Design a protein around this nucleic acid. Structure first.
Length: 155
RNA sequence: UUUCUAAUUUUUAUAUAUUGAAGUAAUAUGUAUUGAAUUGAAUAUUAAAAAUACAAAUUUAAUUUGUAAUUAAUAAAUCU
């Protein structure tokens, strides 16, 4: 949809650097050279793919002291980013937040070997959805008969 | 088929229902993203992201409303 999209896109205004030792040019494109790829899909169906619009320097990118242009209010500029351990659960989310195939999660539960104590919570919220996709799948059939893939598909 | 008689095979065989479950509630990533004149779970394709359960629909040019909310309903017990 067109509405609900930003028209003016402010640019990353670096507030203060996160380091005293300049990351010399030589290594910049030596580590960014590693980021132009990012995995996708988490199982045997692991798919290392490409990322368009790669930023140029990631020592400075987001780790600290850069601004993000979600400028909303009148007196609130592009907020600065505090260091990592200043945000709650970040290196804990790194374990939890990701595309989780249930194939990859139920072997972790039936072996009770969770990398994280919240993957027990990203599991329920994932099954509690798929049950809802059924309790809605059926509270509709109490109206009519809805038949999957019975209408034409494609062009 | 010698004749009188006796006899164990008979134009008599079992057939699918109880229940138009229709009240019980404002919302909140979210009108996701893309493709789209437009699309908000219900154009088209795309489908394993989430969290504080309800994306294979009806509906509308779009939405909101509004229908709907995974349940008691044991023919089996042969009938001779």
């Amino acid at each position: 949809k067109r509405s609900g999209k930003p028209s003016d896109l402010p640019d990353y205004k670096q507030v203060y650097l996160p380091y005293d030792t300049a990351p010399t040019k030589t290594e910049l494109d030596r580590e960014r050279r590693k980021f132009m790829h990012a995995y996708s899909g988490r199982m045997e169906h692991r798919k290392m793919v490409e990322v368009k619009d790669v930023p140029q320097n990631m020592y400075t990118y987001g780790k600290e002291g850069m601004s993000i242009p979600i400028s909303i209010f009148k007196d609130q500029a592009d907020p600065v980013i505090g260091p990592e351990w200043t945000y709650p659960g970040i290196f804990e989310n790194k374990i939890v937040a990701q595309h989780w195939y249930m194939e990859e999660l139920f072997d972790r539960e039936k072996s009770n070997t969770f990398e994280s104590p919240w993957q027990r919570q990203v599991l329920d919220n994932q099954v509690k959805r798929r049950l809802g996709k059924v309790a809605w799948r059926m509270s509709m059939l109490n109206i009519k008969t809805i038949d999957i893939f019975h209408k034409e598909r494609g062009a």
